[PDB]
Amino acid sequence: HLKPFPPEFLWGAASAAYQVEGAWNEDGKGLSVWDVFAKQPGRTFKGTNGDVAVDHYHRYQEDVALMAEMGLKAYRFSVSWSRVFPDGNGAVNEKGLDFYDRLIEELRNHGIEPIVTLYHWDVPQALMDAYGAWESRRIIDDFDRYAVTLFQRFGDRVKYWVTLNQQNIFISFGYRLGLHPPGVKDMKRMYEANHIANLANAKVIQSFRHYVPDGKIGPSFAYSPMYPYDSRPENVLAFENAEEFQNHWWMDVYAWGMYPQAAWNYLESQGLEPTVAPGDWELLQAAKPDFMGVNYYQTTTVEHNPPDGVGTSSGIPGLFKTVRNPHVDTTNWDWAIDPVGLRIGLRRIANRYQLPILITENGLGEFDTLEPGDIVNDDYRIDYLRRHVQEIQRAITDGVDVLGYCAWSFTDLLSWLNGYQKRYGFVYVNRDDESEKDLRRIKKKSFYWYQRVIETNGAEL
Amino acid sequence: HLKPFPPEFLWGAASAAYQVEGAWNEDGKGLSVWDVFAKQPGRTFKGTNGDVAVDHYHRYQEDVALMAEMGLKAYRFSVSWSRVFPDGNGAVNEKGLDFYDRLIEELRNHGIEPIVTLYHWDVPQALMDAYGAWESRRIIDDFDRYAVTLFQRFGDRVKYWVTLNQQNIFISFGYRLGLHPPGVKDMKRMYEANHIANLANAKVIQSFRHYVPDGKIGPSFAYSPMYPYDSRPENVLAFENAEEFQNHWWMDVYAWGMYPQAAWNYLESQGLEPTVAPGDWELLQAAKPDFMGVNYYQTTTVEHNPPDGVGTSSGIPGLFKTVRNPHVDTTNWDWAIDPVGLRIGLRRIANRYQLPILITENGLGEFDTLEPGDIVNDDYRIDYLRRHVQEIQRAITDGVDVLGYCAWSFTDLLSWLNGYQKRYGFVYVNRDDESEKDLRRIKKKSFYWYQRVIETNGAEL
Ligand SMILES: O=P(O)(O)OC[C@H]1O[C@@H](O[C@H]2[C@H](O)[C@@H](O)[C@H](O)O[C@@H]2CO)[C@H](O)[C@@H](O)[C@@H]1O
Numbered sequence A, B: 001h002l003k004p005f006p007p008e009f010l011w012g013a014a015s016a017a018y019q020v021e022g023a024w025n026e027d028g029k030g031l032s033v034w035d036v037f038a039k040q041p042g043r044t045f046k047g048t049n050g051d052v053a054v055d056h057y058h059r060y061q062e063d064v065a066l067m068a069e070m071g072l073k074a075y076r077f078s079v080s081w082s083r084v085f086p087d088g089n090g091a092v093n094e095k096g097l098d099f100y101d102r103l104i105e106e107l108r109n110h111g112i113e114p115i116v117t118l119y120h121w122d123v124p125q126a127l128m129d130a131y132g133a134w135e136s137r138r139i140i141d142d143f144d145r146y147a148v149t150l151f152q153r154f155g156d157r158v159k160y161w162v163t164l165n166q167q168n169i170f171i172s173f174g175y176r177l178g179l180h181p182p183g184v185k186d187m188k189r190m191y192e193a194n195h196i197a198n199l200a201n202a203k204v205i206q207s208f209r210h211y212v213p214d215g216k217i218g219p220s221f222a223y224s225p226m227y228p229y230d231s232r233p234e235n236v237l238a239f240e241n242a243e244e245f246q247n248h249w250w251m252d253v254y255a256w257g258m259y260p261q262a263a264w265n266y267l268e269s270q271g272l273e274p275t276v277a278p279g280d281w282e283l284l285q286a287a288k289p290d291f292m293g294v295n296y297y298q299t300t301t302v303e304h305n306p307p308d309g310v311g312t313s314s315g316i317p318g319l320f321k322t323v324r325n326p327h328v329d330t331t332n333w334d335w336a337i338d339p340v341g342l343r344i345g346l347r348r349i350a351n352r353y354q355l356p357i358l359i360t361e362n363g364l365g366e367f368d369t370l371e372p373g374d375i376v377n378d379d380y381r382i383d384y385l386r387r388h389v390q391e392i393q394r395a396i397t398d399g400v401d402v403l404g405y406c407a408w409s410f411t412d413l414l415s416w417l418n419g420y421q422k423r424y425g426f427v428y429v430n431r432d433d434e435s436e437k438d439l440r441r442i443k444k445k446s447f448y449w450y451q452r453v454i455e456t457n458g459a460e461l
């Protein structure tokens, strides 16, 4: 017998500021590190950038009306720090706050719960210029001041808050892979930045207990649960290594305030462990969240990787390497499609940390065709979303406390580096990589599917 | 490059009182449940029982002299409750205590650390007759009074203590499988007895913090780490269920004072969850151990098990079933041999609980041939031990705090149900299932191997 979705289950959809808003230099907004990075020649596909994106800044009333048509219970968005503090620190921009106040009012006039994301990768460029943003302890207090501003303005009306969204991605892409700002490839720097981000998350949760005492807050982690390839002992050991180094390295700090030891000793053997200050442990341990946010797309299977092995497959010599999983389907971009992996991840979080879970992001990106009569038949997206939602209900039945599900994304949006054509939305936006066209919003088949899921609280999938 | 073993590493060997002592009715000893059970005809191979065993109660001086020849750093043994309280509660038997005092002094006179194990399966029969032993809450205070007696007598001289040894074995074999006393096959009763044993363990740990404030204590768990068969999502899910149900069910209680929730909810759905009294959680949560004891022989591989499936393979329908692992070796008794599995289990306990580990038992059971000139060439036992010790060194290199390693067993001993021929000792005892012969002690080749391990602190294996 499956348990129903609970009565206040947050059936949601989500976006990120840079990906949807546009209005990059309007109303006193300052430059973000992504405004500057995306304009560097060659960094983004076809030079696409967030100057306009899908123009949600100007079109938010129409987008919220579509959310109310769907009957969304929640909408998760991020606040652009550069709209609120153009220089990161210094003077507050009231026009920037007023946008978010208007959005929040629009949502709440339509019965939709705002879920505010403090940070989605868009630190103001002035903090990078002054002190290298996330590589300086200065950002702890600067981020805290920005979060407290939002808690004071909006805490009366927003219950659910996410802090750092996918820290593991903005830190590893920014400092290890060099794919995101600041374009660094230096693992020592990455781990230092990562440690400062940890401190900044904990500081803001501490502040939130003061200013929003009836609210709920947590970080959101980009979680790819690890699988061993098989029951070969060395492959299971590779999975122990991978799960700790890729996943526990973040989530243990969020839940328990401590880094896992094996991974710490591995980094210390490489001279990569972060610099720890007095007070750091006590801060990290005293900032327990209300939930773990999870951004989920796929699992990762791993196998043994010898000390001269792989650094197709990626890994850490002597720790693990990735291997294709022969037992799941793949998307056209070679991501696994693994809905049972979402149940697995959910079970692992409850079993390890006993935390409730907000699923902050899950979705399917695909080329969608706009057919005559403004029809998009994205049954491939319905099938993927269906399967995941089915597995969530199984995890709830097992005993996981799932607070809600935010499908990625509400409208189509700009990808960070790959332009617009791999689409994620319930709502098609008429534009492409060459121009904004008319930016018209067109409901996809999946829109109506999810409207029906919500209406029936997930009895009709 | 491997780290060395730590300088104070406890190279050990172990036994259990029923399996070694004999002297079943001497010096006021009362009946244990095993004295009674093993005399039931047909229960044990060739009617073998503990009346004499290997006669360690009379031959302890010789045995300890051999330990000192080997250079053992630690000797782990169990105390027979029925020697100390013949009726379980009631009057203390000084002559019982005196045997352990004489053993302890022998150890100490030869520079060997005693590791006292409170409980190895031998509750006095009188408690079983009085109130059903582990099925009654009365045993919590009776066990505590027994423990406290030992702490008071020996706490000055014994630093390391183990509480319940292999609770998961005595409880499951006694109440689910009906292989051990009290010969019951009832899961409801099993979980209730298990709950009471958890409270007993936590009560004694609290007591220890008063009586032996500079000591180290913990329970010892019979740990078979689970592996998924492959990377099929449903097999990984089966692993999740199996690790939780078979392993976390005990070790989360020991470390955290909490049962895991998915398994709890499954048992509650079946009417199997234990009865919880006011005060039980607070007690379980306030009795943190210094270390996790681990008895290790093999890993277990699992796969998906349909709701109309297995309850050869064993399992829980809808949760998991066991499967032979084609990737590990086997003894001549078809026990799997999986040394890497020890490293995995070690890694998992440090990763989950951040506890130091005492390996309380690990060894190879095999027929040994006694050659003329009192020669026993057991290179098979050397190979098995060596491989496991090598994996412990890798675990220590990874960052696991391993306190020591107690090889199973110091002398050959009586098995619970299978007599004497599958031998585990470094020291052969000349007796068999039909005859006590002369009970003479013969050093095996493995004796000398281990001697050399200890002399070099594990650098020469
Ligand atoms: O002689 P046997 O029957 O090989 O017994 C060996 C030792 O077994 C240890 O416990 C085992 C138990 O025998 C298994 O059936 C069970 O599944 O595993 C546990 C794992 O610890 C006992 O610890 C010991 O007292 C026996 O000598």
Ligand SMILES: O=P(O)(O)OC[C@H]1O[C@@H](O)[C@H](O)[C@@H](O)[C@@H]1O
Pocket (backbone or CB within 6 Å): A016, A019, A166, A169, A222, A295, A361, A365, A414, A415, A416, A417, A418, A422
């Ligand atoms: O378009 P891509 O490159 O598949 O990116 C999809 C998504 O990737 C996720 O990691 C990010 O959360 C989003 O912010 C983004 O839309």
